[PDB]
RNA sequence: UGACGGAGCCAGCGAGUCUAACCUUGGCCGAGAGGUCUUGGUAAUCUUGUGAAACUCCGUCGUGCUGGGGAUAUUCAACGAGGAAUUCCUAGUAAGCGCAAGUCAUCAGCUUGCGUUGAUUACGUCCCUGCCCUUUGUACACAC
RNA sequence: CAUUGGUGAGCAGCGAAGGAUUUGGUGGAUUACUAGCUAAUAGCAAUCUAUUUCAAAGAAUUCAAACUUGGGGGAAUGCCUUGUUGA
RNA sequence: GUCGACGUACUUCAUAGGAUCAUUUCUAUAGGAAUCGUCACUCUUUGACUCUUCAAAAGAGCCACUGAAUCCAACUUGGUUGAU
């Protein structure tokens, strides 16, 4: 009976599942808050889906991210991709489509690796 | 193309099992073809069944490279990736250089952090045909693995008496023209299968006056690889030894790419059987 | 296969060595190279046109190559396939470079910008994503799945709100200035967007027929009975004569040949859209035919920065007191076609080139497109060529450096020169040389 | 063999090549009746375009493209069975 | 079993994936009591058992 | 780009009732075979699953290297990033870092995988060194 | 310590002589609005009948007609075509 | 290294006796068994229909008028001298 939206972010072998539901405003990564993401010089890589679009988008939803695998920087990249596409998917589903593709324009103008990972590599030259 | 190549493998090995299953029909059809040729009686099993004869009316109008290379044997020239094991030493990178000079239409790929599954996927969707993986032992290159890519066979060889074109002397550059090939006394059926594997990674149809030859000479299950250039003088031929020389021994031939190691083995070297050192191409 | 439209012949036939069926093609600007991509092969076959051979086969897609295009300026190949991937091949000049761009869902309908800087794809989500080529980033998308009129068929058991059949665009085309996109698909709405604001300009209903299938969103529930709809009963045995009592519709046939062999009503669909290279129109290949839409300016008063003192009476007063430049730009600001025509024929020949040099830079595409769509049909050939020579000599550096602005106005000028004026000149040149031969030689006995 | 042209061409062969039977042999349904129900209900597309009649004949190349439509409840429920459901791309 | 995992075909739909469910690791949750009894006994049931 | 000393935190491969030391000092039981117990020394990439290392953070110190026989309770070897030359290399690439396996050939003086961190510079040109191809357009328009 | 698992017990808040959920029937729409019937240039609509009958017009050597068959092999007795014998 | 001839060694090939069924009576045999205008009861097999489970999926869609059912709230009645 509650609205909930699950998305996935991935880098090299990291994986990050984000559950977005209608809540009080709390963002958690692996149970601890989002302000305790290590290695603390990439905390703004985690913070940029939030600050790109303002915390008033997040002030009614509460996200939680379970991250597994990879190393430090793979984990912060999977976290930020999960946060970004989770917020866009919640806005498609339970808020209006105008806000959904405004969020898509904001994240894609910053970098579209917040929404689409680079998936199949390499090249045979 | 993942779904398509999966079910194309599924259909080809279904057809393979069907042909080995009903290839008694091929030979009893040949029996009644030769019995209508020379008017001799039909054996009792064929004389009493009415089905195979009224099918022979249709099957009368039925009737060399092997199954993996048949669709594009002489049509398309190969494309070959040559790569090393992982974190290669410098004599192994020199050897991979020399092997990509050995095969035309072969480029060299740098190996490191390349999982062999997605290296097989990347190779066989960018459309190469062969992959040659080289293994070292402190400089000395010890193995090479030849993989034919549209779900074809991998022959794994071990290299034995390796002398390199770097390690001799500063002798100049190689020829890089499309070479002739010499395949010596590959007499058994495994030898013919390995001849097909080994020669479908050269460009088809060299020139008749092409001056570069490269020989695979089987001498007691030890395929001696030499490369030569020549000029046909007035009394004989004067042969000059360019390029690396070694001896490769086939120790495995299986029927998938490198990535699975669940492929059905066609021939792997039975080393500790009782009759291990009596027969060749065992 | 290539067709020469001068001798009406098929002068080349390109085949692959694989015998596959091609579903899209794209030609080089300077028609050296023709590429074509199938729906069952994943390669893109590149043949040369002069020598008829297969030049190469570009591999790297892992799904059927849905649409191809060649960039008309820098000659790069944009392909796009059902593996959710668009892919940019630099073919010419020692590079052999491939650049993959991932997209959200599987691409049908790629179109390239006229200046070759960008490429807009349609996707099966029903979105149009516009990518830069040189820095392969998403310049912007349009969300296009809610502004689509997908009808309900007579035979389907799911609503039009829930049908997933035709909520996407399978063919798109840029405008020739590069600022709009027309699009259509297997639905009965053709939509045209403008790309800089990413908004829907207008959505056209391609048919209001009920004898076609996908028209109504909401079917009449008087036709639904206690066994099936009433438009699924085949009353083809009540027909008067055998040749249409015959049921020759072999069963699972979709999109084969010969409409009698299908058993179902023809669906309404658009397979290709195109913007006109000369005059402000598009054409869409529906099932009823090539629907051709265009704007005429006899209607729709649409002025351009007029003021309180700019009037039809004020324009003809300035024309009667013969300020011809003032009268002409008052006609442009009214933007009434009869006023532009009246002043344009009241200016005299001695001061065509003064007026034509002193038309402002903003009213220049207006006068060029007016002279184009006027002089196609009007009989004042020497007047219109006088005006064209004056305008091109006056401001033909501005046109050259604003190419895509005057690209559908200058291209209808050389639909007037080479198609009526050069034909007239060919006739008189024939008369000149027949006269010279018939009076300069000796027909004696 | 060429006697397959007389022995083993058969209406049941042409029927085994239908779309609900291809669905069932691809495990995309549990039985041929449920495959007929699912594509009457309009879940199954081949390639990009939705297919709606059960009589469609699905050739050897074209059975690599039988999928469900996106946004289908059946695609949603198998992804969420394996809890790989990504609600970003509608399913 | 490795052959089956390679030939999985991920558009596979059996109706019992409305009852069966998969944990976070990806494996299968088998309810170790029954599946003929319900795991959570309702409040009137717990009233009577207590 | 150090040296100590804490703290934080991140993988992916790998599951055959199978996986793994040696040399001693002694007590007792036993016919012997041997058993048990006790003891010291040498070797060690731990033993099957939990986990890494680089990394991040925090306190302290503070930047001219090394020897045996002689003297009291200083002086007689190698080396402080490696010459001429030569080789290899274009993106998840070079390089760093650990962790597992040990697959009928090869490998343990190691070999092969597996992840983790991840760039500089070319991505043009035939000028040099080379190698190769063509020198009737043929192939059907148009153009050259 | 999570449950983004069931079942309950209650608050805050919402809150005009009540609220929520499900369901049977009928009506209007679901295409663009010129009235009913018949033997119809008019009758009727309370009725067509005790004028509803006559006349006239009207009959292709087309005195041809399965465009309609699942495939291979046959067809005694049929059936079709052609010939023929006796009337 | 290739085929003949001999020697050797091996594989395959038997169908009788009898009965029954097969001709919209009669399978050729008299050694065999069956010709009837329906009244009811019980038992058994099968199929519909209505609902439904594994186990879902799709709703010929909207608006109105009316009727019914269930859960709360409320009121009334019975209830610690004992409701469930």
Curated annotation (Swiss-Prot), chain A:
Gene: RPS16A
Quaternary structure and interacting proteins, as annotated: Component of the small ribosomal subunit (SSU). Mature yeast ribosomes consist of a small (40S) and a large (60S) subunit. The 40S small subunit contains 1 molecule of ribosomal RNA (18S rRNA) and 33 different proteins (encoded by 57 genes). The large 60S subunit contains 3 rRNA molecules (25S, 5.8S and 5S rRNA) and 46 different proteins (encoded by 81 genes).
Misc. remarks from the entry: Present with 33800 molecules/cell in log phase SD medium.
GO cellular component: 90S preribosome; cytosol; cytosolic small ribosomal subunit
Protein's recorded name: Small ribosomal subunit protein uS9A
Signal peptide extent: none
InterPro entries: Ribosomal_Su5_D2-typ_SF, Ribosomal_uS9, Ribosomal_uS9_CS, Ribsml_uS5_D2-typ_fold_subgr
Organism of derivation: Saccharomyces cerevisiae (strain ATCC 204508 / S288c)
Cross-link (Glycyl lysine isopeptide (Lys-Gly) (interchain with G-Cter in ubiquitin)): 28, 45, 57
Protein location: Cytoplasm
Modified residues (Phosphothreonine): 68
From Swiss-Prot, chain B:
Record's keyword terms, sorted: Nucleus, Ribonucleoprotein, Ribosome biogenesis, rRNA processing
All residue ranges annotated as the Brix domain in the record: 78-259
Compartment(s) of residence: Nucleus, Nucleolus
PANTHER family in alphabetical order: U3 SMALL NUCLEOLAR RIBONUCLEOPROTEIN PROTEIN IMP4
Alphabetized InterPro entries for the sequence: Brix, IMP4/RPF1
Function of the protein: Required for the early cleavages at sites A0, A1 and A2 during 18S ribosomal pre-RNA processing.
GO biological process: maturation of SSU-rRNA; ribosomal small subunit biogenesis; rRNA processing
Official protein name in the record: U3 small nucleolar ribonucleoprotein protein IMP4
Annotated SUPFAM superfamilies: Class II aaRS ABD-related (SSF52954)
Keyword RNA-binding: no
One protein family per Pfam: Brix
GO molecular function terms noted in the UniProt entry: RNA folding chaperone; rRNA primary transcript binding; single-stranded telomeric DNA binding; snoRNA binding
Gene Ontology terms: cellular component: 90S preribosome; Mpp10 complex; nucleolus; nucleoplasm; small-subunit processome
Subunit structure as annotated in this protein's UniProt entry: Component of a heterotrimeric complex containing IMP3, IMP4 and MPP10. Interacts with MPP10. Component of the ribosomal small subunit (SSU) processome composed of at least 40 protein subunits and snoRNA U3.
KW rRNA processing (keyword) present: yes
Swiss-Prot record, chain C:
Chain intervals for the UniProt region annotation (Disordered): 242-263
Subcellular localization: Nucleus, Nucleolus
Start and stop residues of the WD repeats: 17-59, 60-99, 102-141, 164-203, 265-303
Modified residues (Phosphoserine): 240, 253
Record function comment: Required for bud-site selection and cell separation. Also involved in nucleolar processing of pre-18S ribosomal RNA.
Family: Belongs to the WD repeat PWP2 family.
Note: Present with 16700 molecules/cell in log phase SD medium.
Subunit structure: Interacts with snoRNA U3. Interacts with MPP10. Component of the ribosomal small subunit (SSU) processome composed of at least 40 protein subunits and snoRNA U3.
Name of this protein: Periodic tryptophan protein 2
Gene name in the database record: PWP2
From Swiss-Prot, chain D:
Transmembrane regions listed in the UniProt entry: none
Location within or outside the cell: Nucleus, Nucleolus
Residue span(s) of domain S4 RNA-binding: 17-83
Self-association state and partner proteins as the record states: Component of a heterotrimeric complex containing IMP3, IMP4 and MPP10. Interacts with MPP10. Component of the ribosomal small subunit (SSU) processome composed of at least 40 protein subunits and snoRNA U3.
Function as written in the Swiss-Prot or TrEMBL entry: Required for the early cleavages at sites A0, A1 and A2 during 18S ribosomal pre-RNA processing.
Homology family: Belongs to the universal ribosomal protein uS4 family.
Name of the featured protein: U3 small nucleolar ribonucleoprotein protein IMP3
Organism: Saccharomyces cerevisiae (strain ATCC 204508 / S288c) (Baker's yeast)
Shown segment, full-protein numbering: 93 to 183 of 183
